[PDB]
Design a protein around this ligand. Structure first.
Ligand SMILES: Cc1noc(C)c1CO
Length: 147
């Protein structure tokens, strides 16, 4: 009925239908319409104390909980979607990845090279589309597919 990984859902506050992708954790009101060898993505990573390496250029010892990191991620998603902030601006300032200095850009990549939840979300995103929170051993990501 719908593109890969989409399902209908119902808003608990408005009762209106919306669409949720269980691979990207994206959600949207409008019905989704609709794979390449390679995709190009940017990301904003928020690490937590159970990240594989709980350190980054922002903090020598990263101590925030997983729950706290998800709250930060959710707040960045809100500001990106409202247009108060740009994805790139937030990634440059607050991503716990070395790619922050490149506005979050990771370049292009194939299947097999990235951690699996990140890879699957990246390839299920359409060009220009942004993920919801994506969980990996590194932490929690917001992913933007650019190509
Ligand atoms: C937008 C934006 N994203 O990253 C940087 C750096 C800028 C400019 O303020």
């Amino acid at each position: 009925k719908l593109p890969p990984g989409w399902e209908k859902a119902m808003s608990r506050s408005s009762g209106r239908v919306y669409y949720f992708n269980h691979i990207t954790n994206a959600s949207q009101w409008e019905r989704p319409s609709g794979e390449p060898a390679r995709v190009r993505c940017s990301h904003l990573l928020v690490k937590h104390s159970q990240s594989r390496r709980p350190s980054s250029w922002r903090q020598e010892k990263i101590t925030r909980t997983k729950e706290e990191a998800l709250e930060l991620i959710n707040g960045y998603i809100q500001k990106i979607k409202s247009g108060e902030e740009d994805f790139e601006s937030l990634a440059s300032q607050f991503s716990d990845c070395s790619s922050a200095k490149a506005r979050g850009d990771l370049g292009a990549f194939s299947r097999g090279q990235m951690q699996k939840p990140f890879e699957d979300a990246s390839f299920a995103l359409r060009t220009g589309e942004m993920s919801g929170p994506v969980f990996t051993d590194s932490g929690i990501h917001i992913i933007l597919r650019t190509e």
